[PDB]
Amino acid sequence: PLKNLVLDIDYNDAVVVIHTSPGAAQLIARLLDSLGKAEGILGTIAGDDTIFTTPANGFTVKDLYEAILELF
Amino acid sequence: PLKNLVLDIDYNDAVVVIHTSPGAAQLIARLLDSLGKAEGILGTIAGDDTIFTTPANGFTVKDLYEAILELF
Amino acid sequence: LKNLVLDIDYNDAVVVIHTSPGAAQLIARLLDSLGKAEGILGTIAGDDTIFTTPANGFTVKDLYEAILELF
Amino acid sequence: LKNLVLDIDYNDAVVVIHTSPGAAQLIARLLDSLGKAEGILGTIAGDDTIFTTPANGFTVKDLYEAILELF
Amino acid sequence: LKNLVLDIDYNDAVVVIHTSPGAAQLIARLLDSLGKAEGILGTIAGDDTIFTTPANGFTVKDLYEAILELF
Amino acid sequence: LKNLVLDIDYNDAVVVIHTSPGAAQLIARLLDSLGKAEGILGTIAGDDTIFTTPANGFTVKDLYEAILELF
Ligand SMILES: NC(=[NH2+])NCCC[C@H](N)C(=O)O
Ligand SMILES: NC(=[NH2+])NCCC[C@H](N)C(=O)O
Ligand SMILES: NC(=[NH2+])NCCC[C@H](N)C(=O)O
Ligand SMILES: NC(=[NH2+])NCCC[C@H](N)C(=O)O
Ligand SMILES: NC(=[NH2+])NCCC[C@H](N)C(=O)O
Numbered sequence: 001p002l003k004n005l006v007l008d009i010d011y012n013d014a015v016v017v018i019h020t021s022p023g024a025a026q027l028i029a030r031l032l033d034s035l036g037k038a039e040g041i042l043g044t045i046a047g048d049d050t051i052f053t054t055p056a057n058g059f060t061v062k063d064l065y066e067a068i069l070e071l072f
Numbered sequence: 073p074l075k076n077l078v079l080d081i082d083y084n085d086a087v088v089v090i091h092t093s094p095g096a097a098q099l100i101a102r103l104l105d106s107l108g109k110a111e112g113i114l115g116t117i118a119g120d121d122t123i124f125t126t127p128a129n130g131f132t133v134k135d136l137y138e139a140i141l142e143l144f
Numbered sequence: 145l146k147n148l149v150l151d152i153d154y155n156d157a158v159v160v161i162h163t164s165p166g167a168a169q170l171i172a173r174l175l176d177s178l179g180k181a182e183g184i185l186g187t188i189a190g191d192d193t194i195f196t197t198p199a200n201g202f203t204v205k206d207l208y209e210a211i212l213e214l215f
Numbered sequence: 216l217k218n219l220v221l222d223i224d225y226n227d228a229v230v231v232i233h234t235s236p237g238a239a240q241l242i243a244r245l246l247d248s249l250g251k252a253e254g255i256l257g258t259i260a261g262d263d264t265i266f267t268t269p270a271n272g273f274t275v276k277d278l279y280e281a282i283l284e285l286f
Numbered sequence: 287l288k289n290l291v292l293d294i295d296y297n298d299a300v301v302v303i304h305t306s307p308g309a310a311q312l313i314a315r316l317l318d319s320l321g322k323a324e325g326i327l328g329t330i331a332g333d334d335t336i337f338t339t340p341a342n343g344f345t346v347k348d349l350y351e352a353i354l355e356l357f
Numbered sequence: 358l359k360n361l362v363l364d365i366d367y368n369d370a371v372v373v374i375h376t377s378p379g380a381a382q383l384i385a386r387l388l389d390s391l392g393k394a395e396g397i398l399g400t401i402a403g404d405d406t407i408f409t410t411p412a413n414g415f416t417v418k419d420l421y422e423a424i425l426e427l428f
């Protein structure tokens with residue numbers, strides 16, 4: 001699994017969104033599930049090529065954003 | 073569905089996030105789908121082990137959480 | 145055909161499109177025809193529920209009407 | 216929903232249907248109505264490919280014809 | 287969990303387990319607890335169906351027996 | 358990475374590819390860039406297992422080899 005899989009990252013007020021190659025969703029997501037609530041991720045949901053991840057309390061959507069880039 | 077399939081319920085300003093054992097997400101989200109917008113749930117979406125469920129207008133997240141807890 | 149998409153609505157965070165069992169990934173696929181330049185930031189489908197959310201600049205409201213347009 | 220299915224074929228074990236992206240679940244959902252008495256033992260679907268199989272007392276080709284019946 | 291398993295039959299190649307919707311992946315993850323050693327090559331679940339296949343050294347009947355065993 | 362691909366084996370019906378959790382859709386997409394001309398009838402993939410089949414004129418064994426060659 002290479003960065004070549006994560007096609008794009010952006011976010012808004014409620015969720016942080018990741019775009020990947022088709023079929024790589026669940027794979028990049030399991031990576032995010034390594035992080036966790038105390039690191040800012042309340043949860044994560046992957047489709048085929050999209051991943052919606054959301055911040056925990058104490059965290060802003062931007063905070064999560066920066067934390068994920070660190071993991072990636 | 074055994075209550076054991078459900079590992080943890082938590083939330084924030086936009087969604088309630090239910091974690092479950094690998095694989096049980098689609099099964100448990102079935103229960104959440106028993107309810108309709110009326111009880112507050114706009115929609116529900118499960119992946120493999122995470123479920124994001126959101127509220128309808130008039131009910132907040134704190135609301136949906138309590139609601140979910142009652143159903144489980 | 146259109147029939148598959150049951151209801152469309154929204155709230156504070158996302159727009160939720162329901163479908164007949166199994167068509168969520170197909171209709172959600174329609175949405176992926178859009179893109180950032182038209183409001184859509186991303187879309188996830190399960191079996192029969194799709195959660196699409198607005199990019200910065202648009203609102204969950206703007207996005208909503210745009211999907212009806214698309215449909 | 217015909218243009219969804221891109222192909223049908225088979226072999227010494229299953230019937231292999233190909234489809235447009237995300238359709239795998241739609242199409243396989245249609246083949247789930249039939250049941251064992253129609254030949255089918257079961258049906259599975261990934262993202263764009265279904266794999267169906269005839270039950271005890273049925274041939275793959277037969278099944279291939281049967282799906283072609285309800286297609 | 288067992289009341290989720292609709293039925294268990296089979297044929298020449300696979301052992302098709304039907305389940306309640308969504309139950310699929312859970313029951314299959316159960317079979318995955320077995321592994322090659324018990325005569326299971328590999329398993330794959332959709333939404334409510336589980337196609338499994340025996341390993342060289344056990345036939346389809348045998349897989350079936352050991353599955354009713356597991357269950 | 359082919360490390361996401363844990364084990365390969367086959368039988369008288371399909372080639373079974375056990376991969377890391379979630380990797381099953383990605384790697385089936387790799388086998389998906391082959392098809393009939395190379396002997397692949399179809400390939401359906403779950404969360405960590407993938408099931409492929411040889412077309413006509415080709416044997417599962419020939420496929421097991423080609424699959425390693427794809428790898
Ligand atoms: N190959 C597909 N299923 N494409 C549709 C994907 C739709 C949406 N991005 C999701 O992840 O659910
Ligand atoms: N077996 C897996 N695919 N695990 C990864 C799960 C990714 C994400 N947490 C989801 O549930 O959608
Ligand atoms: N037949 C089912 N698997 N139903 C569960 C649906 C759960 C959720 N609404 C989703 O679309 O993912
Ligand atoms: N976008 C994808 N999921 N691509 C991989 C598809 C793999 C396999 N043909 C399936 O139907 O599951
Ligand atoms: N509610 C649904 N989407 N059902 C699809 C069933 C298709 C097939 N039986 C499978 O296991 O994938």
Ligand SMILES: NC(=[NH2+])NCCC[C@H](N)C(=O)O
Binds near residue numbers: 311314318378
């Ligand atoms: N996390 C899971 N859903 N595990 C269950 C896997 C079941 C089966 N081996 C498949 O690939 O479909």
